[PDB]
Amino acid sequence: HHHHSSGLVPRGSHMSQPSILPKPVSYTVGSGQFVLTKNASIFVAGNNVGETDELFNIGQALAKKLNASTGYTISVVKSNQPTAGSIYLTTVGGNAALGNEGYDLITTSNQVTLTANKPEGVFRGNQTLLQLLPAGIEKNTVVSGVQWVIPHSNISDKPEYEYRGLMLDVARHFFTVDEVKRQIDLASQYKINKFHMHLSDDQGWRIEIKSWPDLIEIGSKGQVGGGPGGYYTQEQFKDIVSYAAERYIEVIPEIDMPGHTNAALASYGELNPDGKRKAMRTDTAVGYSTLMPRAEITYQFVEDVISELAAISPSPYIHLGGDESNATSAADYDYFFGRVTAIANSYGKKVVGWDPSDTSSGATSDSVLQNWTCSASTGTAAKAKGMKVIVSPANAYLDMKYYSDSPIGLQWRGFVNTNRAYNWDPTDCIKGANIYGVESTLWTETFVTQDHLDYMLYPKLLSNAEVGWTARGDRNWDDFKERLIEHTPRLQNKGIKFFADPIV
Ligand SMILES: CC(=O)N[C@H]1CN2CC[C@H](O)[C@@H]2[C@@H](O)[C@@H]1O
């Protein structure tokens, strides 16, 4: 047999017909179609009234989306007796083998029926349902001239990995609450279920801490390259968390320590050995900053921050960073990371940290490693301790240039095009681990606008999303590439300023 790898498409990028991404466990099509008309309702039915009420909210979110493009006013009914032409969302009789996020989705001429185990799984299945309707459905304004049809079809589905996440760096360049919500919204449509916010770094501190007000008054006032910066009040952070929750997305806030801490060091002189504030930094260096690992003030500061953040962050996890502490000795890092893990745990939060944070003797088997290095020895400690691992290899570093000539992005992990973002498996990063799942990271040294975010995340994030959801035996670049071409009008329809990658 003969085999080949993909080159660029001759003559440039390529960027009744459902476009399902990530690819579901199974999808068959039969004869006939359902027609969504102006008289359609969404019926919801759970195993008790409280579950029905949660399904009702999910139905209303679906209706709002459908109404925007169809110009209809589809309403939601609490009943297990849907009428011909109805969409029906239920958790009564879910197939347990499909888990919390899994669902069956069967479309007949008279009815769309989504059957899941939990409300969360109906939310995920609704993302597939939007992809079964014609391109045009994902428009934010009324589309005319398109019959709203869904082919007679049968889908069953469930994720391969539990953790399928996106990190946004809001420290290097700040993005508004609206801009963050939009990225969360877009990601949710591809079954991303986790959002990691990198809220502090050398060039900016982005979360209001009432007990340490100069973190904002001084530390939020810049960004890479110099510029106004910005921050989230605690109310604005709660608003983000709530918006994410409606999409069954967990938000994990990161306060990076003991390195990548210049913004805090520039806000409070008492955090520095000489008692003086650092100057704020707008460059892109490079592992130089450290908290004082042997000063009690450091741990008082960390505790105040953790206390305030824990009070407003319902996720059982807090991310404490731990990357590139090059100005911290190995002994002091071990010590520091163990102490701050104990503080976090005292506030009822489990700690996620970048490698090498798993090597801290203060870590517990409840701590999580985010493995970005992905070398042979990375996560030896995590594995030995029974710690779950989230992988973020080069293939998930979405801030890398697509190509040598990309007008934005970095290149310290090489180039990451749409193909590279697809052709990998979490087991490539680490062997012998409990892999919790995958996280796409979008660092923002070089991204200043929403259009920059769109360009790098789309289509790359779609590749990573499939690696998290679709089983490896069912993944194939040639298949995905052709599906991505078909999906293009949908990206356009959503207003995504994607890069038309010439490898697609
Ligand atoms: C976990 C991680 O990727 N940390 C840093 C790794 N460095 C390497 C050089 C880049 O500035 C990049 C920076 O964007 C990231 O914040």
From TrEMBL:
Q: Which of the seven top EC classes does this enzyme belong to? A: hydrolase
EC number from the UniProt entry: 3.2.1.52
Query: What protein is this chain from?
Result: Beta-hexosaminidase
Whose protein is this, by species? Paenibacillus sp
| Gene name, Swiss-Prot/TrEMBL | Hex1
